[PDB]
Each structure stands twice: as C-alpha cells, then as structure tokens.
Amino acid sequence: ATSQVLHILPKPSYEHAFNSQRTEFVTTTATNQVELYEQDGNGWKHARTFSDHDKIVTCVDWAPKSNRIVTCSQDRNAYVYEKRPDGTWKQTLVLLRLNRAATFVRWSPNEDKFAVGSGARVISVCYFEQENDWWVSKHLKRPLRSTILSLDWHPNNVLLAAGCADRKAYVLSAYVRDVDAKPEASVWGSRLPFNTVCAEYPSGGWVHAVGFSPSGNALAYAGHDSSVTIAYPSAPEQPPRALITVKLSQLPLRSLLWANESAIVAAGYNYSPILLQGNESGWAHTRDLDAGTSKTEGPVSFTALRSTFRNMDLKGSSQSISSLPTVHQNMIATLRPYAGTPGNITAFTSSGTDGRVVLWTL
Template sequence: MANPARVIVRGLAWLWYTAHHSPSPFPVGNHHTLPQFYSLIHTAVESSSCRLLAMAAPEAHHLFHNPIADHSFSPDKATLAVARESNVELYQKSGNKFSLTDELKGHEKTVTGVDIAPNSGRIVTCSQDRNAYVWERTPTGWKPTLVLLRINRAATFVRWSPSEQKFAVGSGARVIAVCYFEEENDWWISKHLKKPIRSTITTLAWHPNSVLLAAGSTDSHARVLSSFIKGVDTRPEPSAWGERLPFNTICGEFLNDSAGWIQGVSFSPSGDALAFTGHDSSVTVVYPSAPEQPPRAMLTIATRLLPFNSLIWNGENEIIAAGHDCEPYRLRGDENGWQLAGTIESKAGPGAGSAREESALNMFRQMDLKGQTQADTQLKTTHQNTISTVRVYEEADGVVRKFSTSGVDGRVVIWTI
C-alpha cells in the first residue's frame, strides 16, 4: 500500500481514502462525517513520514503590513531597527520572535534610511523631510541629535562608514552629504560631494578603507568618489582606485548599458571590485586597473528577471542580489566572466513562507471547501512582495554565513547560506 502521508500531501486525500476503504466507513461527500476525515488527514500529515511541511526554512518575521524602506540589526543582533513611514521602530528579540519595544520619533515625513553602527550602536536615520538624526542611547531613552545636512531635497539613503567616524547621506539635491562630528561645536556637520552628479542619489556603499564611497544615481551612473576629510580620516593605502585622494576626487565613473537607474552598489570585501545593479535587470562588476585608467575588466550580466534593488558580496567570487522577483539570487564568477547561478530559496509550494504558519487541518479544510490550499495571489516565495534591502547579517573574513532582507510586504527574513 502507498504511504498515505505522501499521497495526501500531493492533494489526493479523498482518492486515496476511498480506494483503500471499501466499503467506506462514512459516505464521501457527507459533511457530517468531515470531522472524522479531517482527523485522519491531520494524523497522517503530522506523522514522521510527512517531511514536506517540515523542511528547513528561512527565519521570516512578518512585522506589519506596511512597506519597509530599510532595516538594520544591532551588533549583538538582539535589536532590529525598521523604517516604517515617518518613524523608526525598534524590535527586541525574544525567543524566535521580535517584539516592538521602542519608537524613534522626530522625522516629519517618510524615513528612507536607517543604519546601526556595528561597534558603538549609534543609530543614524534620514528622511524625505531633508533631515538626518544621530540617536544615542541614554539612561532615559534614545537621544536624537540633528545633523546639518544643508540639502533642499529629500534625503534618500544613509550608511555609516566602517570606521564609524563618518556617515554618508544621499539626496534628491544631486549631492552626497558626508557627515562627521565636530568636537569644538559638539555637533554633526557635513561636506558635499557634488560634481559630476547630475541626478538623485539612490544608493551608497563604503569601501573598507572608509574613504572611498560608491554611489548610484538616477542619471544611470555608478561612481566611486573620495570622501577624505582632513583631521578625521587617516590617509589610505594606495590602491587600484587611486593614491592621492583629496575630497571629491572621482576614482571611477561607470554607465549602465541601457541607461537605467542604478539601484544598488557594493564593494567586494577586499575593495578591489565594485558591483552595481541597474533597472535594466543587469548586474555589472568592475575591476579597476590603475588611477585614471580604464578598468581591466567590466562585466555585465544581463538577466531575464525583474530588476534587482540591492546586492551584497559573499567573498570575492559571489554576489547575492534581490529585488522585484521577491527572492534572492546568486551570481558567481571572476574577472574572466560572471553568470547567474540561480535562486537561493527552495520553494515547497504556493505561499511557502506563510504555508508553514497554517495548521495541516486548516490546509485540508480549505482544499475541501474551496478546492485550493492558498489564495491564487499567494507567491511561492517567502517574501510576498518586492525586496527593498539586502544586508549582511553574519560573516567571517568577508564570507557571508547569514544575510537579511526586508521588503514591501512588511517582512524581515534572515537567510542561512
């Protein structure tokens, strides 16, 4: 006899039961006997022979039903900061769940970026209200300090430098505000990276040396610029990107093949390569050769997927990217060539992310009443809408062990590689 659990999971519960019980102990279709049938189904599905619903899965946290513009974890991974509308919500991990514990209120319009410094734990936020705040924990709560951005358009993106001495804020004013703390006046001030930026900054990424800054914008260019500030930065070691790097030095300027908006940028762990993704569903990897020289390799990977919004490196030979296809993908290669290696997620069926939240009993009740286990609009992916941000969650020597994603569906998901 066939294993009942395996047959049932394939959606043939009624056929299997009637085929192996003659005469049937209860008439098929008689809804007075359905509780007995559901009990049988529940027993079979929960048995050890049914492995489909017990597959290892990403750690998904459905926080709310609003879009998440950005997210960041604290150094100990116990606190999660999430940009929700005009506030930043702080969640504390309790067991396997995150619970809302605090809110950072100060912005008047949509918060577009949030980042927690990996060592000090300070939080920086930016918003469409053209302001940025640095939040520091005190015995009485989180204390905000207004940053003098000096911009007349929305702030769009923010990230701390690896040294935590500076942070960069992208904007719709065609400038990048590089912010640092001035001890004499006890405030955060900024210097502007301007030329040759000609449109809104959509994304930023720091080089490991905390001086070079990669920026993507809606003028279809990814650029590498120097943010060196005397008295704050130490002079970086010479590299293929440049040797003498005064503020606003252009170390590289790269155009997307289809003139699409640049959605995500990222330096490799060594800083010797740059990857960026455009709205034409491509990923481009650049290997610089020498200062003021063309790159020794510039490779574009065209895909048939929807556009990516964000990407990170996993070592020097793998990139993880995600966006409008609602799931993360791998790209692998080197200077000789790159290719799309496929999706990271293994999908068990429609609504894989939320199907695990349903009981087996309810799943088969829906199958009986509606002829389906999930709504027709349910995706097979963990995320049910566009992924906005991909961030490293856990890594060692540049090799990522875990990464996190957040998206328009209000979910934050932690993935294990």
C-alpha cells in the first residue's frame, strides 16, 4: 500500500473531513478553532479558521452532495456551516440540548440529518425544519449508559450504530418522520421507529469505533482491548449468525473503515493502518499497510551547529531523537474514504495526534 503525507498541521488532529472533490479539507485542531485547508499546487494552504465554539472542538464532518460542515465541541454545541455565493461560510448554532460535551458527529447518507454523540448518556439526532428555519434535535437515550465515543450511519438513512464507553456497541433506529421515507425491511428489522434497539453487542474494552458493511448487512466495531469484532445479525429478537472477534497483538484501534464487503482497514494507538479480511465463516488480520511495522561526511548548516549545542545543553548529547518507523508519530485518530465507489474503497485518508494528514492507496 502506497502512502503520501498531504500536510503536517501545527497541532493535534482528532478529526478531518475532505469535501466531495477532495480540493479542500476541514480539521479540528485541539483548540476551540477549526482549520479549513485548500490545495496550493501539490501542497496545502490554511484558507480560514472557524472559531464560533467556546471550548475544545471534538469532531467535525463535511456533507458531500450539499457542501455543509458540521462541528461539535466540549462547549455542548454544534454549528452547521453553509457556503455563501461570495465564498464565505455562514455559521448556524444548533441547539443540541446536551447536558455535557458533544464528542462525535456524523452526517447521514442522504445529508438531511446528522447525529451527535455525547458524554450526557444520549445522542442528539439533528434535522432541519423549513417551517421554522431551525435545526432541531431528538435524543436517542433508552439503552445508552455512558459517553458515546463514535457513530456510524447504515447505508439506508435510518439506522445509527454507536460505540460506547460502557463496553457496548449499539444499533439504534434514528428514523425521523417528515425527513425519512419508510425504511425497507432489513436483517436489523422492519418495524423500525425512533430509538428502537436492533442490537446491544458486547466488547472487551470501550468501543472506540463502529462501522456498517457497505451493504449494511453486518457491523464491525473496535474495542480498547485491541480487538475488532464483526457482527452478522439474523433477525429482530434473534441472536447473530456469527459474532467474530479478531484479537490484535498491537495497541488498540481507534478508527475503522470497510474497504469492501470482505475487508476492513483499522488504525489507532498502533500508529499504523492494518488490513483485516474475512466473512461470516471467519476474519483475520491479513496485512499492515505501513511498511514501518517492520521497524525500517559533508558541509553542515548553522541550524545543525546550533541545534547540536542546544541538544548537548538541554538533553544528554548532540544526537537527535529518532522518528518512529511508522509514518504517523502518534496515535491515528480518524480513518476516512478518499477514492473509489462505495463498496470498493481504493484509497483512504487518516489524521493523527501528530498533526499529519496522510493518504493511503490499497
């Protein structure tokens, strides 16, 4: 797998999103700001900040077809950003009605609603009313017992998966009338009203990541125990066909993405994207996409003269501290499609706590 480092951000990057044309990306720095980056030849340039949040921004997402950015923060708010004709962005506060921080945000596949995970034991499913010119929030709350660490939407607009700090992965209906048309019958159910519970799958550690299969017929999720579990449902009120856990030898995956119906890429505290492959008969960790998993006299500049004396003075010796062998130098926080049709992701991007934004080609 080829990798290219697109940019190095000055501060940590728990989330990023590209637009549909991959011509700009938005990223959450560790502050209350969000950074918008545009192309600059083969490089990238900081086009503008957003700074409407009061406390640390936790997550950000960019809607492909409708070209809107949604942002979430420890200030308990969300803002939706929409493009004006003159090229500036219109902010819009969304009243999430959360008692604690917003922790994670995702746009729905039809982009008519988004969901915000929280530390408040609830998920704010947010949709727009043209009759009021308001974004309004519905709380999913019945089975959720702790911080929601991650969200994913089923390819049908109704079902929401959630990874939770109570060591469970939930599948919940986020069906909203006068936004959704009725969902088709599925392996998760057919009688599917708001906050109906399709699964409460267990984990060995906090569920950092969740992801539906490209067909929607299975859920992968990743735990803080350094495992990926893949769940194949049977029917409502019935146990799964298979509930396959693969246990990794590395530090935990924080993020997770189906490459196709039979393969998953995952990454996290191991600093490296891994590939898992399988089906309802069994799953295995099959490759590491970073070759760095294998642990792989002339004139001298003023900045080398000065830094070797600063290293002798501040540290033990002149010798510079070496890079980690992986491309990411710190945990890789998010893992997102970049190229190929849905069901056949050909390339994906990652961003990390080291501020690298990196493109990976399978």
